[PDB]
Ligand binder design. Structure first.
Ligand SMILES: Cc1cc2nc3c(=O)[nH]c(=O)nc-3n(C[C@H](O)[C@H](O)[C@H](O)COP(=O)(O)OP(=O)(O)OC[C@H]3O[C@@H](n4cnc5c(N)ncnc54)[C@H](O)[C@@H]3O)c2cc1C
Ligand SMILES: CCN1C(=O)CCC1=O
Length: 351
């Protein structure tokens, strides 16, 4: 139901958000070179044999080398620049401009989240782990809800990826990246709740962005390149305003104090397992999108029972790294929400 509203919000906002997410400020993300998957130790089953790491959609053998998952889900060298202190990604928003007197940068706009062929049992297990580490301390005041929230979140993040991989599928025949209505239906379409969870997430990440807007410092005016950027982001955050934001989508007002952090743990601990993803491009976004939600949560759980002086520390002293993650995640969510509609039509003009 409440859908429709987000669909309008998403429409009057898509053009500007994209142009924003392409800006120099938001077009690069810092990614750790070496990946340490702590899970392939005292073995549980994590399949690394290429046979079980590929979605059995296309018949890969019957395809060229340069079309194998190994290539579809790999960055494009030429783009990724060196990561030092120049990418203030580590700084806090409150310290980007003067108020008074082991990794690299991946060009995001160049490595869009799409169908890479990655899947199979390896991918199945990953997802499976995340859904399973949904177990907070019982007895706590909010036990249940925390998981219905957590689960819901992941589930959307899951659909978010699925949608993207269907809107940007590869025509194994013509060799043109195009939408795949059938696949969209098999993964998302025929499962009402999955489409609903993406909307859920959109409302969370949007409400998170909204909540902090009033506190975003003047972080970009001083950078000769991205001047407008801060203001151009306010502009967006504003058109977002909704009645939905009155719901406590993430049970902030009902969750335990200790319990909350626990909820945050599962996430930095998901964003971690993201190193067990052998596909390079899937890992990238799984690490952005996950840090995204993790940040959305930090924002919501704290702005909650906080005064003005506090809402200051919080937002201002939040890393550029996190703001890219957040907005970038809202970017995926924005397009997933839209590809849904763009598919209901495609499905409509079926007969
Ligand atoms: C972090 C991560 C990032 C990935 N990124 C990409 C990518 O960018 N591009 C690409 O082509 N592939 C990507 N994949 C792979 C993709 O998510 C699938 O696993 C894959 O396409 C193979 O699909 P499948 O049908 O085997 O299982 P999936 O469709 O993953 O199914 C896993 C199982 O979970 C259930 N399930 C599916 N969706 C949901 C949901 N939303 N909520 C609750 N349950 C669900 C299914 O019923 C099934 O039991 C990624 C995997 C991980 C773990
Ligand atoms: C079997 C259910 N469960 C998990 O999935 C992890 C902790 C727990 O008790």
């Amino acid at each position: 139901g409440s859908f429709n509203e987000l669909n309008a919000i998403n429409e009057n906002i898509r053009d500007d958000l994209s142009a924003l997410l392409k800006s120099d400020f938001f077009k690069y993300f810092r990614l750790d070179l070496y990946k340490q998957c702590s899970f392939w130790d005292a073995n549980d089953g994590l399949c690394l044999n290429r046979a079980c790491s590929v979605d059995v959609v296309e018949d890969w053998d019957t395809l060229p080398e340069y079309w194998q998952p190994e290539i579809l889900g790999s960055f494009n060298n030429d783009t990724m620049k060196e990561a030092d202190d120049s990418d203030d990604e580590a700084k806090f928003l409150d310290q980007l401009c003067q108020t008074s007197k082991n990794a690299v940068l991946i060009d995001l706009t160049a490595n869009p989240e799409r169908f890479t062929g990655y899947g199979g049992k390896q991918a199945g297990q990953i997802w499976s782990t995340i859904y399973q580490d949904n177990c907070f301390t019982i007895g706590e005041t909010g036990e249940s809800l925390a998981k219905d929230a957590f689960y819901r979140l992941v589930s959307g993040f899951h659909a978010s990826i699925g949608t993207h991989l269907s809107k940007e599928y590869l025509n194994t025949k013509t060799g043109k990246w195009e939408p795949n209505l059938d696949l969209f239906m098999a993964r998302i379409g025929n499962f009402p709740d999955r489409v609903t969870n993406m909307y859920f997430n959109y409302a969370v990440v949007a409400k998170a962005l909204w909540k902090i807007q009033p506190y975003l410092p003047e972080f970009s005016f001083c950078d000769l390149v991205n001047k407008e950027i801060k203001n151009k982001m306010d502009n967006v955050i504003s058109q977002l305003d909704t009645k939905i934001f009155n719901e406590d989508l993430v049970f902030a007002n009902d969750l335990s104090l200790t319990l909350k952090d626990e909820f945050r743990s599962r996430f930095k601990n998901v964003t971690k397992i993201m190193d067990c993803v052998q596909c390079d491009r899937c890992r990238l976004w799984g690490k952005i999108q996950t840090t995204g939600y993790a940040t959305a949560l930090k924002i919501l759980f704290e702005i909650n029972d906080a005064d003005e002086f506090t809402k200051q520390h919080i937002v201002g002293k939040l890393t550029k790294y996190e703001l890219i993650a957040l907005l970038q995640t809202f970017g995926r969510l924005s397009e997933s929400i839209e590809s849904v509609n763009m598919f209901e039509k495609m499905y409509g003009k079926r007969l």
